[PDB]
Design a protein around this nucleic acid. Structure first.
Lengths: 118, 212, 121, 46, 116
RNA sequence: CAUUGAGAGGACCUUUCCCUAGUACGAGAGGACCGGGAAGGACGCACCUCUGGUGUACCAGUUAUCGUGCCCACGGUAAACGCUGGGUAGCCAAGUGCGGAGCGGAUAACUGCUGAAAGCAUCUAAGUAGUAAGCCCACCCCAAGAUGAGUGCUCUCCUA
RNA sequence: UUCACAUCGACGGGAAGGUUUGGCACCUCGAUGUCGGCUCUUCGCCACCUGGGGCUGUAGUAUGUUCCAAGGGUUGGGCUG
RNA sequence: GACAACUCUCUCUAAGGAACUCGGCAAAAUAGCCCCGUAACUUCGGGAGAAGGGGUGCCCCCUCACAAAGGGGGUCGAAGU
RNA sequence: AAGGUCACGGCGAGACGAGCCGUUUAUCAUUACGAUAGGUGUCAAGUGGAAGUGCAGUGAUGUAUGCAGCUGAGGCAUCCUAACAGACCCACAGACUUGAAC
């Protein structure tokens, strides 16, 4: 039984992340992993979209702890952002790990795309 | 003339509410340091208009002068810093004796207006106050970013008043309008409100229902 | 963000290779063409075995862009090139096989682009 | 930029006396600092 | 506008300001009590609190960062042999900003730094 | 301290698409007025939760060289970053929210209702009704130096 | 198709405006710096659009012309100073 | 001291790339050494370093004109004059 | 005198003046105030694996200690340092005249 201070960013953000973790579990996505994203989109009836790709960054600001992902579709260069705490995703699967010496793979956009096909 | 009494609260950062439908909305978080106690009502009898005078930010008595604290102890309430009224039509039932009004009156009313001191930017130029254009950056030009022509020729002989000059941009209060309410917290004393209030986290903020 | 002097690659096999897009229709901003906005393209070069030659004004659809794409679901989609589909004003293109993936919001106005697409993300 | 005419004794004694009154305002501060520099426990002026 | 830019920049450019910080905190650690201006005084206050608490935990890494920051060689090794014996249990606040008369020729607000 | 508001500013802008409805109309071909909804464009007021630009607080890679006695590891310089790779807080938009409301008042053009000067008539000479993005008010801010200097609450004038 | 006045209106006539080219040489040459562009105004209505209406050789869509109305808007470019 | 507008000397800039403009003016980009290769035309001297493309840092070994240099291999960085 | 101003510690305020927030036995306890700035201790956060040692390698280098090491402009806690010492302005019923009741 304690009254609360003006530190409500951390407790709204903390209980938001704890509620979204209570809904679905999420293992942590470090930068450089090769992961899958299973997305729920209505009216398509397939209800499990395929998003393979390589995480480029993690702009973690509490409930927007996000994923900058990249996969070469047969045309070119698709770069999708994912909020990890959104109710629209279903599960994540850390398939591989590049073991890259960088926190921000923005060089890898405009490189040779044989090193970017998931 | 406002359509009802409002409250005032302080801004405490911004975040994103995740709606269970799947959308991501950017909300501002509102706290409440102390309850918005009605301190002084001014009716049609003893005043030319009708308004309900509330206040905010209970403090130490050293922080508050003798006319202020004498005015607040005339109502028999706590000594508090901020103090504003809302002008309201003559159907009011408000006692000035310590009406610690609770914040339930805004959730069903999914439209609210907010006023606040925007962040000041000091003496800024005409390129950002009034959204001008700059000159040519090159091609031998010399009037980069400058104010350009100011008036017409000989026949005015002066410049028109209210002409767009550089000056102090921010610092005055603004009201942004019809902002739809969202998830209140009956224990965290925190109201989500989808929008962008005027000012950084910490300032006073009028939170009063709409006037459409 | 598609300026009126950009080069867009083709996303179909209609007969062109890239295009200088000219002065978008619909959204009257015309200095920021987001997805789904038709553009008054002109052909910079083309495939010389098709009735689409040089210097030919045509209408096309911006289907990929290097600028971001704010979605309500929280995702942000962006490509690495700029792409258009040589289109006619009655819906469908005059090129059948669509190259490269597209998004899915333009299904609400251009359904034939989605139905002829290899991937809809 | 070049001044069209000159000022009077009027406006000049106004502006010079605003300058010297602006010099007047920064010595009661010096009287307060010179008075606090006197006998008393003040954690300044080593 | 300067909203929330909490670096305290002087009337000098960036690298010259860094050299002013390192030299003046070096000779501040040499003599103890020093005459500065007040901008230079607070600018010494942050960095010299960082250098007292840097060699508070007298490891090799702290001693090498601390030797990298301070100019003189024989003053870093006279520092970690002195700061746990003196400034243990203080837990911050290692200086004092005793002000003085302004400087003849500039009317510069002039301050005076202790170690307490 | 709290506001009334005389006066003054800003905002009152505009386009497709859908229902009504392929309905009135038209031999067909074509295709409504009126009343709603939705997506835009410019403009404006804000904000940094997301996406970024910068960020000389920062951290990381590396070249030449000089110091730290020397190896390691650091520091200086290569203008006011040596060149790059990213970035928190600020600032900003390309990003994010919001705005442009009124069976409120009076009118301009017009349509009228009774209706006489000429027992017919006529929107008018008496009275009066619908109605313009136009005028005013409402809308957001400043605002009693509005010398016409307002109104309300509260504090203090003691000793010889 | 009939039909001066839905719309043009020949032969002629009457005005307003001071935005073109002109006429005079009245201020200025002990100095009033022309043309175009950028920036930034503000104003007029002789209205291109938006709002309301009349008439139409206006079936509807779209008009033609005209009345009130200047609040707001009036694009990006290739040529050329 | 401070870290307003605005001028100047610099640095970077999402998306696009001359749409700016009198005019790519100015800035940005190329840049060193070796290897491959190099057209129209010609006064047969040239153009020519045309254009265009690849390697480049550092540790091993051997061939070694037994000084330059070569090939093969590994190693890091997003990026090696 | 009430209330201001200087000084003081600063600011999400600011060219300078302004404005705003502090200006300390800077709570004691049963439940919103008496943390202003710096430092410190932690938590978000940025770059991203530091030195030293061991191991593998002829060596460039990789690996374990070790989401470690620095950064900490942001949040909270903490009186450790500076908010000490002061000074000054404004005072002493608010002229004159009518009407009302007391």
């Amino acid at each position: 039984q304690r009254v609360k201070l003006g530190d409500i960013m951390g407790i709204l953000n903390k209980k938001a992340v704890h509620a979204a973790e209570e809904l679905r579990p999420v293992p942590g996505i470090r930068t450089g992993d090769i992961v899958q994203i299973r997305l729920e989109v209505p009216e398509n009836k397939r209800r499990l979209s395929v998003y393979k790709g390589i995480v480029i960054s993690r702009q973690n600001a509490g409930i927007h702890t996000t994923i900058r992902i990249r996969r070469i579709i047969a045309g070119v260069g698709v770069e999708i952002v994912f909020p990890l705490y959104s109710p629209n995703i279903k599960e994540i699967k850390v398939v591989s790990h590049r073991k890259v010496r960088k926190a921000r793979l923005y060089y890898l956009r405009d490189k040779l795309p044989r090193l970017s096909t998931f | 003339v406002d359509a009802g009494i409002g409250v005032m609260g302080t801004k405490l950062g911004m975040m994103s509410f995740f709606e269970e439908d799947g959308t991501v909305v950017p909300v501002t978080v509102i706290g409440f340091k102390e309850g918005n106690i009605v301190t002084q009502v001014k009716t049609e009898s003893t005043d030319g208009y009708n308004a309900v005078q509330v206040g905010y930010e209970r403090l130490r008595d050293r922080k508050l002068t003798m006319p202020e604290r004498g005015h607040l102890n005339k109502a028999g309430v706590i000594p508090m810093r901020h103090l504003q009224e809302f002008r309201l039509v003559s159907v009011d039932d408000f006692t000035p004796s310590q009406k610690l009004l609770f914040e339930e009156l805004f959730k069903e009313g999914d439209m609210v207006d907010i006023s606040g001191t925007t962040i000041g930017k000091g003496f800024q130029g005409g390129i950002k106050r009034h959204n001008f254009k700059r000159g040519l950056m090159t091609h031998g030009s010399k009037s980069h970013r400058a104010l350009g022509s100011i008036g017409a020729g000989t026949t005015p002989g002066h410049v028109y008043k209210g002409k767009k000059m550089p000056g102090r941009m921010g610092g005055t209060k603004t009201k942004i309008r019809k902002l739809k309410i969202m998830k209140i917290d009956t224990d965290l004393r925190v109201v989500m409100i989808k929008g962008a209030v005027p000012g950084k986290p910490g300032n006073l903020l009028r939170l009063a229902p709409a006037k459409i | 963000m598609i300026q009126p002097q950009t080069h867009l690659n083709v996303a179909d096999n209609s007969g062109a290779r890239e295009l200088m897009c000219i002065r978008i229709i619909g959204a009257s901003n015309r200095r920021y063409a987001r997805i789904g906005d038709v553009i008054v393209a002109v052909i910079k070069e083309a495939i010389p075995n098709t009735p689409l030659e040089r210097s030919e004004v045509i209408r096309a659809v911006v289907v990929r862009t290097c600028k971001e794409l704010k979605r309500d679901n929280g995702m942000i989609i962006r490509y690495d090139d700029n792409a258009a589909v040589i289109i006619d004003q009655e819906g469908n293109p005059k090129g059948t096989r669509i190259f490269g993936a597209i998004a899915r919001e333009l299904r609400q106005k251009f359904a034939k682009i989605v139905s002829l697409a290899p991937e809809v993300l | 930029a070049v001044p069209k005419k000159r000022t009077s004794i009027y406006k000049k004694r106004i502006r010079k006396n605003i300058w010297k009154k602006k010099g007047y305002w920064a010595a009661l501060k010096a009287f307060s600092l010179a008075k606090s520099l006197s006998t008393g426990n003040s954690k300044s002026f080593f | 506008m300067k909203h929330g830019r909490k670096i305290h920049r002087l009337s000098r450019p960036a690298d010259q300001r860094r050299a002013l910080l390192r030299g003046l905190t070096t000779q501040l650690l040499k003599h103890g009590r020093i005459k500065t201006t007040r901008a230079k005084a607070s600018a010494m206050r942050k960095y010299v609190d960082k250098m007292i608490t840097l060699a508070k935990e007298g490891s090799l890494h702290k001693r090498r960062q601390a030797l990298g920051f301070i100019y003189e060689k024989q003053i870093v090794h006279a520092l970690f042999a002195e700061v746990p014996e003196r400034y243990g249990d203080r837990n911050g606040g290692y200086t004092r900003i005793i002000r003085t008369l302004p400087r003849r020729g500039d009317n510069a607000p002039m301050a005076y730094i202790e170690l307490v």
